[PDB]
Amino acid sequence: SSQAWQPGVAMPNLYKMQRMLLEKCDLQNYGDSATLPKGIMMNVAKYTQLCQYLNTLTLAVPYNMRVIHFGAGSDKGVAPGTAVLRQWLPTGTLLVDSDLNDFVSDADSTLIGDCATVHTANKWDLIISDMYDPKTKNVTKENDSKEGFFTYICGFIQQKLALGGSVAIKITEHSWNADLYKLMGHFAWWTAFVTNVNASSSEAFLIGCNYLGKPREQIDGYVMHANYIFWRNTNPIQLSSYSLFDMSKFPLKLRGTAVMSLKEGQINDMILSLLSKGRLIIRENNRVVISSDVLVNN
Amino acid sequence: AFAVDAAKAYKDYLASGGQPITNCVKMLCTHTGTGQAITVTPEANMDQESFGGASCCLYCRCHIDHPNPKGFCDLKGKYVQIPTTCANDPVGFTLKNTVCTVCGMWKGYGCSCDQ
Numbered sequence: 001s002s003q004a005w006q007p008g009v010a011m012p013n014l015y016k017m018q019r020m021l022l023e024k025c026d027l028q029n030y031g032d033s034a035t036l037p038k039g040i041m042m043n044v045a046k047y048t049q050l051c052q053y054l055n056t057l058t059l060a061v062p063y064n065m066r067v068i069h070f071g072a073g074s075d076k077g078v079a080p081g082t083a084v085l086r087q088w089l090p091t092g093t094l095l096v097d098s099d100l101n102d103f104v105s106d107a108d109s110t111l112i113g114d115c116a117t118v119h120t121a122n123k124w125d126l127i128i129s130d131m132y133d134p135k136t137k138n139v140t141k142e143n144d145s146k147e148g149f150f151t152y153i154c155g156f157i158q159q160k161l162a163l164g165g166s167v168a169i170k171i172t173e174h175s176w177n178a179d180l181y182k183l184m185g186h187f188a189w190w191t192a193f194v195t196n197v198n199a200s201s202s203e204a205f206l207i208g209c210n211y212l213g214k215p216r217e218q219i220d221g222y223v224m225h226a227n228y229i230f231w232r233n234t235n236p237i238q239l240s241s242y243s244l245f246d247m248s249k250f251p252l253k254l255r256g257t258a259v260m261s262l263k264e265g266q267i268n269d270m271i272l273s274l275l276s277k278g279r280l281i282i283r284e285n286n287r288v289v290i291s292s293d294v295l296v297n298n
Numbered sequence: 299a300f301a302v303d304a305a306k307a308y309k310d311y312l313a314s315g316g317q318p319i320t321n322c323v324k325m326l327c328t329h330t331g332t333g334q335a336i337t338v339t340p341e342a343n344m345d346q347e348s349f350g351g352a353s354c355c356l357y358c359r360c361h362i363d364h365p366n367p368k369g370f371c372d373l374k375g376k377y378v379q380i381p382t383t384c385a386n387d388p389v390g391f392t393l394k395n396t397v398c399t400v401c402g403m404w405k406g407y408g409c410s411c412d413q
């Protein structure tokens with residue numbers, strides 16, 4: 001596999017076009033581990049490879065870019081993924097992160113609490129989520145679409161993602177949501193991306209590239225998750241840390257992508273085509289204001 | 299007049315043989331950077347490692363106030379370069395050392411302003 005020198009593997013288009021039934025995920029390389037560079041944590045390696053893959057897509061990168069990162073804490077009380085995002089994003093990018101549990105972070109602002117308590121006045125150019133509930137991994141009951149934070153994420157995308165913006169949302173065999181797959185059809189392009197360092201896990205990042213705010217294609221999320229598991233079940237991915245050793249072209253290119261305010265009636269097919277090419281962001285350019293709802297009781 | 303002196307407490311803990319603070323966030327980078335102490339992106343040279351700044355700050359990590367009137371942190375949101383020989387204890391290194399104000403390197407670990 002030439003794939004071992006890539007940052008990871010994206011779900012091939014033909015697999016997206018199938019109509020598979022959902023099966024249990026049984027990875028050939030389950031339990032194997034990549035050899036990480038000395039002293040480098042899995043979460044730093046994983047986010048580095050995610051960002052290396054996002055470098056290959058037509059991301060909109062405006063001045064004063066706005067990025068929000070959900071699930072950014074660790075059981076060590078630090079934010080390794082936020083540290084990689086801050087390394088990757090252009091200097092001056094506004095980066096906000098959040099987690100249920102307290103942690104210390106390099107983000108410009110951090111909100112502690114359930115993601116459902118997070119509200120923002122502004123729209124965002126990029127949404128990253130690593131949220132995961134390990135209780136979903138119950139091999140003994142039916143693997144149905146999950147709600148919880150996925151319900152929040154779906155609404156947050158529809159209400160607070162700028163047109164032209166993108167997302168990368170962690171899923172696993174058991175941690176997934178049908179509506180989130182359906183929402184992937186509201187972007188110009190989408191994939192499920194597996195990092196080469198964590199290829200022994202059913203984890204992937206569901207990536208929606210350039211948001212259009214309306215269905216471009218109709219996706220059945222139950223079918224699409226079955227398609228994803230079928231791909232993983234029949235395509236073993238060789239664990240690899242190779243791409244971690246060449247960081248010379250890591251930083252996200254500062255593209256100066258135009259930001260315009262438009263009301264829904266002026267989004268014509270010419271605007272939709274600029275959005276689809278990563279050439280336009282549609283949102284206000286006012287002040288970024290966030291808050292966390294606090295439940296007050298005795 | 300009472301103030302908790304966490305810096306002294308950590309130094310005394312280290313000198314008594316305590317294990318340094320762990321889980322400082324080490325970054326992947328080229329190791330062909332400027333080598334300056336505290337930077338907006340990782341700048342480790344061949345002799346350094348680069349770390350996320352908040353994770354190397356004693357006050358950030360211990361959840362205590364920063365020792366200045368404004369409570370501002372010099373590390374959070376930045377990257378700190380640590381000599382590889384000292385990278386087992388980034389918090390202790392940043393606590394014990396000083397940045398040269400003209401060249402931006404660590405005094406005694408890159409600053410050549412006095413030779």
Ligand SMILES: Nc1ncnc2c1ncn2[C@@H]1O[C@H](CSc2ccc(Cl)c(C(=O)O)c2)[C@@H](O)[C@H]1O
Binds near residue numbers: 072098100114116132
């Ligand atoms: N509804 C919600 N709102 C806000 N934050 C949320 C959230 N749900 C989860 N998180 C947060 O996401 C982060 C990553 S999840 C995780 C946790 C432990 C392990 Cl051990 C693993 C693993 O197996 O790798 C993965 C966690 O820090 C969690 O606190």
Ligand SMILES: [Zn+2]
Binds near residue numbers: 357358364372
């Ligand atoms: Zn601090």
Ligand SMILES: [Zn+2]
Binds near residue numbers: 400401402409411
């Ligand atoms: Zn000097």
